[PDB]
Design a protein around this ligand. Structure first.
Ligand SMILES: [Cl-]
Ligand SMILES: [Cl-]
Lengths: 113, 113, 113
């Protein structure tokens, strides 16, 4: 499912039994200015479960501080690094440190109507 | 499923049998400035259905007015008041009155691959 | 599933075999100034598959350029044209040409608790 590309990568974890998906962590330091966005690297290479797709989903605590998720639809049987688009829609600079929890990866089945 | 914590709370409703989820209503009054966000309280405590999570989803009419949803991933078998992060990305202030329909809560089952 | 209302409409495509949903295309020319949003017409009418709802989901390519999705919850047995709210949170004017891929429509079955 998940492979570490570097020793900076942290394995995606589940916060709770009833967690919708997997916690994602930044592998690098970032500084996002207000009204700007940054693609954050996890350094986790992922293999999409067959007949499923992924959605990068917001942390509530970050959303309360103005930080939103851009994009995050992971499909087409994607194999590669997990990137997270953090959008700073707050008034102040937002700092990301290596190892910070940044988002959740939620799996759902592809529906074929 | 839904417990009104105060007399200001309104029971979440499915308006049509084809609705994805349950209409949520503000339990309080708010005035959201342009470029700002606010956690809107519903005063509704929810019991999560087993192996499910909830997503706060936008009203289309509000999205056309520049109002978006922040956060809104309700998981971890969450027990407590439903809050909706309303983001005003319009040019003018957005008024939220008690009783206003603010969002929809959509349930999905958790997929643990 | 999909019906063209005009000669300008382009039929939604499932890209890869592991695509989450169907690519949507603009039927018209649009100019979106920074900090503004626009409802983009596809001129494609849809009939909702039984016990399902739709979600307009972002293209990663546009999200990385600062283009986000507003609204996009298609429920309540929806019959009619598909429109996509594109939000220009970039710093320059965003151009939408006829035939441009603008988003994806992702179907999910409604969970009834
Ligand atoms: Cl943490
Ligand atoms: Cl979403």
């Amino acid at each position: 499912m998940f492979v570490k590309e570097t020793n900076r990568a942290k394995s995606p974890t589940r916060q709770s039994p009833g967690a919708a998906g997997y916690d994602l962590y930044s592998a690098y330091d970032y500084t996002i200015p207000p009204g700007e966005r940054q693609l954050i690297k996890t350094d986790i290479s992922m293999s999409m479960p067959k007949f499923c797709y992924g959605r990068i989903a917001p942390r509530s605590g970050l959303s309360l501080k103005g930080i939103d998720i851009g994009g995050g639809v992971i499909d087409e049987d994607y194999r590669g690094n997990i990137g997270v688009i953090l959008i700073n829609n707050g008034k102040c600079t937002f700092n990301v440190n290596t190892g910070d929890r940044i988002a959740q990866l939620i799996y759902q089945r592809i529906y074929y109507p």
